[PDB]
Design a protein around this nucleic acid. Structure first.
Length: 270
DNA sequence: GCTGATGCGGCGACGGATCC
DNA sequence: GGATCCGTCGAACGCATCAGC
């Protein structure tokens, strides 16, 4: 079954207008994504803040098109030192953040503090084929939760990006045949449930659309999975509970091409 | 400098068994 | 004997290194 994201809801449940638009995109190769016109899509989306994951690009190789985004002029990039062509994340913002830091105290995490909230974008480590990196993922999950818990102690938190797990069976097309697969192990799902519990956080999209199936943000390049919408929901906006009144909508931009992930977009009334 | 090989890291199609 | 359940396997991508010119 194909999926059609509902129209953008730009007013909070109470009736306040959205003032902040955040777009998160796992671009799977920033340079390839730019050549596949992904930045033309960003310009049409016109977000206040853009978070990118899996850029696979060091700062000295960023294409000059990125210096031509005047409404996203404050840019922060993080790549691994060891493995240049892998991982990597970026955060672009219309306004300067108050503070920016990297890591969770790998080029996987950027933390940016704004006036009324802290934003984290993450490329969560994949468990690997054959689950060869699942134990590392479990240790990483626990270190990440502890780091996030110790941030939400100040302002509310928005966490976005590729969290590399489909939380529940509704979050992927083939839950039964993938329960031993990276992204849908009981270990990764439980780690997600624990993140929501411990910090605490809510899944923005699931909060608004608790029963909507076939909503995915990732499709393997092979076996024409995307045209069949055989996909996984791996990309999220998770919010502190104190931000749920401010939540207008959480979108999945199914039609935007240029990666094996599609963009996601958050509308907040702050 | 440039190309294209190879290497590495991000599962759905399918073939076979079991169940009523 | 259709539905379901399970383990096996081939392959689209992006980017790195490397050879060769």
């Amino acid at each position: 079954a194909l999926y059609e994201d509902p129209p953008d809801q730009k007013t909070s449940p109470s009736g306040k207008p959205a003032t902040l638009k955040i777009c998160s995109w796992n671009v799977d190769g920033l340079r390839a994504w730019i050549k596949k016109k992904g930045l033309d899509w960003v310009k049409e989306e016109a977000p206040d803040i853009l978070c990118l994951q899996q850029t696979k690009c060091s700062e000295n190789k960023l294409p000059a098109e990125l210096q031509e985004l005047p409404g996203l002029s404050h840019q922060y990039w993080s790549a691994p030192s060891d493995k240049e062509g892998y991982s990597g994340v970026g955060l672009l913002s219309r306004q300067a953040p108050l503070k920016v830091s990297y890591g969770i105290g790998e080029g996987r995490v950027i933390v940016a503090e704004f006036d009324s909230f802290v934003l984290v974008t993450a490329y969560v480590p994949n468990a690997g084929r054959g689950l060869v990196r699942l134990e590392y993922r479990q240790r990483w999950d626990e270190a990440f939760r502890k780091f996030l818990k110790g941030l939400a102690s100040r302002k509310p938190l928005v966490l976005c990006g590729n969290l590399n797990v489909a939380h529940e069976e509704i979050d992927l097309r083939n839950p039964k045949g993938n329960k031993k697969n990276a992204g849908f192990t009981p270990q990764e799902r439980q780690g997600f449930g624990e993140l929501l519990q411990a910090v605490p956080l809510a899944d923005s999209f699931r909060h608004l659309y608790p029963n909507t199936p076939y909503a995915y943000t990732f499709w393997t390049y092979m076996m024409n999975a995307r045209s069949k919408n055989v996909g996984w929901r791996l990309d999220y906006f998770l919010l502190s509970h104190s931000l749920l009144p401010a939540l207008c909508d959480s979108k999945i931009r199914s039609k935007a091409l240029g990666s094996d992930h599609c963009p996601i977009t958050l509308y907040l009334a702050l």
